[PDB]
Ligand binder design. Sequence first.
Ligand SMILES: C[S@@+](CC[C@H](N)C(=O)[O-])C[C@H]1O[C@@H](n2cnc3c(N)ncnc32)[C@H](O)[C@@H]1O
Lengths: 87, 91, 95, 98, 107, 107, 383, 93, 93, 75
Amino acid sequence: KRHRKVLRDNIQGITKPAIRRLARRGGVKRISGLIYEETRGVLKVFLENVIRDAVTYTEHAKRKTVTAMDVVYALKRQGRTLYGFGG
Amino acid sequence: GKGGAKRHRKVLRDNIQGITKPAIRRLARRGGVKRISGLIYEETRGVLKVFLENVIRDAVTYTEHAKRKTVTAMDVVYALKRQGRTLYGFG
Amino acid sequence: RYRPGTVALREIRRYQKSTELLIRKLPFQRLVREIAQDFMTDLRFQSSAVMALQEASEAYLVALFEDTNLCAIHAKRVTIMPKDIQLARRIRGER
Amino acid sequence: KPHRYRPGTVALREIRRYQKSTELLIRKLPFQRLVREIAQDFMTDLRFQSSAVMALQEASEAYLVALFEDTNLCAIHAKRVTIMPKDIQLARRIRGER
Amino acid sequence: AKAKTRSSRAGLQFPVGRVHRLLRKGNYAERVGAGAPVYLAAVLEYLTAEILELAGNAARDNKKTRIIPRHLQLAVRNDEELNKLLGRVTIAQGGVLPNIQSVLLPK
Amino acid sequence: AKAKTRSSRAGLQFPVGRVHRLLRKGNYAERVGAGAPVYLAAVLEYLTAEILELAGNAARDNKKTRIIPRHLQLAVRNDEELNKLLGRVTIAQGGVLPNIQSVLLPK
Amino acid sequence: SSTFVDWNGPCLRLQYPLFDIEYLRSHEIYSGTPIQSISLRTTAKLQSILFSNYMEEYKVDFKRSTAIYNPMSEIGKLIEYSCLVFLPSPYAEQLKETILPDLNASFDNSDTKGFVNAINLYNKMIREIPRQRIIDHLETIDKIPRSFIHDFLHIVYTRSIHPQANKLKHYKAFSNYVYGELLPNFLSDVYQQCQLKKGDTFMDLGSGVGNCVVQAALECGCALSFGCEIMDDASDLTILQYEELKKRCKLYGMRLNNVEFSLKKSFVDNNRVAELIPQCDVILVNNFLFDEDLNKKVEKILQTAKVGCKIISLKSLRSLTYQINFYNVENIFNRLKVQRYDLKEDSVSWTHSGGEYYISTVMEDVDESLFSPAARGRRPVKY
Amino acid sequence: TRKESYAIYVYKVLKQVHPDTGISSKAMSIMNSFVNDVFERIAGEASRLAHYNKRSTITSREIQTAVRLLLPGELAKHAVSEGTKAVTCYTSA
Amino acid sequence: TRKESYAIYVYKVLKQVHPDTGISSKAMSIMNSFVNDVFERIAGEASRLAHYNKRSTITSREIQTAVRLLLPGELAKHAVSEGTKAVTCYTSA
Amino acid sequence: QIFVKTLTGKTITLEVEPSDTIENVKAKIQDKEGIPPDQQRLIFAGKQLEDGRTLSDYNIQKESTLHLVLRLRGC
DNA sequence: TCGAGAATCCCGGTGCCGAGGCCGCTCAATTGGTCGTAGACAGCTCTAGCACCGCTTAAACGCACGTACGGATTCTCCCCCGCGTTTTAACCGCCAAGGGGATTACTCCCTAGTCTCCAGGCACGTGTCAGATATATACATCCGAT
DNA sequence: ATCGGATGTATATATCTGACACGTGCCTGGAGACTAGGGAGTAATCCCCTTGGCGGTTAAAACGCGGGGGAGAATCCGTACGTGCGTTTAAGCGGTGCTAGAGCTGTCTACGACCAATTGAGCGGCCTCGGCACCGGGATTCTCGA
Ligand SMILES: C[S@@+](CC[C@H](N)C(=O)[O-])C[C@H]1O[C@@H](n2cnc3c(N)ncnc32)[C@H](O)[C@@H]1O
């Protein structure tokens, strides 16, 4: 603990039941034991891409707050337009 | 004995068999396909027809807006770019 | 005791007919914050932005799992396995 | 008897041949006729500048080749080497085209 | 003279004037036709009317008189054309339609 | 008052002037900055240099001194970053990278 | 072993005296001058079944490009129709057994000598037949093949339109004044669906070369078949086609009803069209690419349409988002029962694929379909 | 500052089609985002069309062609019908 | 009339990088299309960025951000460094 | 008795007499559904009913069907 | 098939908080003028897309052998579902401070605009050599027999 | 496994050849030099919304234990797709001619930009009540092991 609390891994925070529920919403009857780590990795990559884009928007705006419009524009850039948060 | 018609235009026939079985075979071989089922040919002809109808419809819409009777290469390039199929070498 | 595959189908019905977020809010918020700590500046992450990120991530993973289930069914299996996800992301063009 | 290659050898030979080549694998005139027929739906007479038909052929061949790459990946995922129409349908469904 | 909104002239609920100002201020072109904002407002109103009609049908079928994101999602995805238009779009709090593959159902 | 091109000032081969004129006439914004065309021309020159460097390497691998569309295709698709940039792009007369799935080769 | 004519094809039942028996019995010598097939661009002479003094030359040669015109196929069709329609028993039997096998074999094998010999023997065998028996059979006819009038109209088309077919490509615009024909099969289908009958009136808005007008007047016996056209090239071709049709109809003894054309002047703001719309029983409008303004003008014209009048079209006359708020209570489109049907293959001349076509019947009352919001939809919604 | 949106017009169209149905704030925001997204799509397509033809004006023809290109199938036909009807009604005033 | 293109500058860059290597007309056209497409991508992204921040101008900052958003990975870093070098050299003289 | 059909697909029943005039029917529709008189137009047999005329002028039959059009905006 | 047993649906009552409607108050849409110029129409040029024909021969197509791989069956087995108990951390609710995201006001440097000058690049033309194509041969690879 | 036979194809050299590279006219777009407006930078202030914490509750996660059901491996069938060969088809080349549709140039007239005055549409704030969420209990429907 120096000046800011460096967050721990927190990718295990996407728990096994959470990934199970996400699969169940997709119409998945059975899930392999290795699906959980694979889904964690895929989610990490996707979040890295989208958050990198959103932070690029924010730093261009000379802001230190990642506004919801930044996330919406980042997702619109990636062909994943999100409705319900403005645009 | 055989009948005929032909009115003001040479009405082209189905002409999707012109995309022959060897042509689809070569296209699959370029894609790394070692073995091709016998039903791939009709399915691929249908897929090619659907894709070509979409692209040509967009290109002819572009031509319609331009008040032209000629589908220029730019029309096809813009139609393909609209679908995310951006084509280089023609404009 | 219900047989295997019964409660799984009941869960599929429960979560397909419902719209609440399936990831816990705070763990996903912390994950988003760490993913953004790669930039030295301490970001503030307007709460609607975290919610939008969770919406997008959940929708993306749901669609990915639909594709994974289709891949698994294509292979004469009902158990999705990591090669199914890899195939889905490869066919989509993400890998 | 005459020298005959076992199945799959000449298939790999054509894969290697056509992967290092760039010429069009669909013949020009049949594809041109197909394009003209697809555009015959509109009552107007269209001219199809010669570069436009070539561009359509490039785009169609690239689309079909990528589709067959995806189909081959799907078939190999199913523990098979023979692509089948189910494979093309799966590839187009996952791609978002259906 | 008395002011009369162009939306009233076109019989449109959507704001033809705001659409014209958005087209001019959006820098879509150097100049914007007079009939362009009317056409665009009419198209937007039609698409909104279609989606709202289907969403209200969904809400009525669910015995609810208030459209929520779930009803919009059902309306969009149940209709092939609207789904294809909004294929790459995510609707927040929409969920996904009930769809269990026939292979997964019990034998 | 000798005329010195802005590309010469920036040490760029690409046309800073034409880039500025295209940005002005492209309806991208009401006004275009003075340093913007220099930056965009520099980026375009760098990317063109990357494609041409890799394409010339491919041509030298084939013992050919003219870059053809096949060499551009090899340059783009053999580089991960350029392929990702041009993932949705089709290069005419480019072909495909030589690749065969491992299980398809004979045992 | 194949025949030029589908002998088992649909048979159209004649509902009026199609064959002018009085004209044939009163006139024995042909004086008209149809465009000879030889003049279009080894020869064989086909002898007219009814008029002894007329003989038509055909360039019988199986080495030219028959993509545009096939004189040998026409000769085979005419001999088969003589065997089928214009000849009584026992002559029909001998004409069928003697010529048709040899003629079909020659056509299949491209035997020029055999084809010419078949034509010559056919002419010799027709010449000895009394004309009285032939006219009596034409008097006693009550049905003929549906393809007969189709091939007859195509013969007139080849004499008239093929020599100047390219002139039809002078339309300048992409979404108006563009020329496209509807094949006679589709015309027979819609005329049967719309129940055209003797004494009815047929109008065709944008008749082009007048295929629909002449076909209606022939195979439906309309009291007046009307057609309006604007294009000058299509107008001149319509004049040529009607003259050729009159000559050919006189050649075969077929009565041609009152056919009227308003050429080189738009149907919009037209007096003749305005006064003829009230008495119309069928109105065919090829609005496949008519723009919205021309659709509105057609609506304005059709306001005066009567009850029971059926309007054939390639696209719906009513815009698919048509409603009734203020300026529709006095409008005709409210009373239009619109019924969609699917176009068959080879139904239209501009393409082989097909599509859809709508028949709009003018009802006594307002159409009940538009009131239900379900009909207004493009095509339940629950989890 | 005033944050403009299509809320009142979306509500008016809702009462036009469904007089006895309301719409929630999240659904209202989704509809507003949809209207903005489709407006941007059609306007950008019309801008590209005008640029391709070297034309400086976005007329009703450009928007009609853009609507034909964007919307699939019957949606395009009905939207073009609505746009042409609106333009015809507006010009006659 | 004159049809402008990036052919001469692509050739100059080629002779800068590979002095002994030519380029074919088809390859030159493909390179021209690549330059035009990347120009359109970067300019459109910069226009969107200017609109989002309610800015009427496209200065070097919007172009740099568009390059960061568009180019992946090391391409973005190298392009940004090259653009910064070009702008600094241009402003120095 | 008669029936009236509205654009929303709702069938509404009216109890009137042949001597009844169009105006009283119009107010009857008003009081049962709240739609004011000036906004509503009546159609029968493809003919618009006139306020000065009456039902017996148009020869209404028993168990007949009328149509009601609501003035939303107009031109 | 029947019984027992767990989700799930529904009925009613209660509670709540956010959608709907109302009230000001801006200020952005509307009206009314001119005025620059975009582009619709007309006329002319010209070159390229359509159409035709003939010949060569490369490629498509039909058929036959055969073999290997897709599909079905059967077996093991291990891993992932379902359920129960403990544990852990999300969640809600509430407090607090303060970071910085809006917002306004001032200045003033940057860029649109325009005018004139001029040289960089695009059309055209011509040299000439990289690449394609010809054959001919060496070498690598597949496959059958031992 | 290893040795020859046949095959494909790779390498090599010779001879074209038309497309690439370079030279030149010039003209149209780029560059230099004011001018003036306003968009953007910078400074000050408000207070919204963010961080952090904290404590209590309670749903959800994690751990552990059957066990049976699906994944994977092995075997066998047979048929359907690969490979050659001989025939047939028509693509491709290679000439010629038509003419009409794309492109460019020249009016000039409608149309949209711009600007100033006006005010009603539309948005920010605040009731307020009823449609929807929660909770208790009863009915319904499916699931599973006999
Ligand atoms: C698609 S063709 C139909 C020809 C013919 N009715 C048929 O179906 O075979 C349409 C014809 O309508 C004509 N047309 C289009 N607009 C017209 C108008 N406003 N007034 C008169 N004729 C018109 C054109 O000349 C064109 O030949």
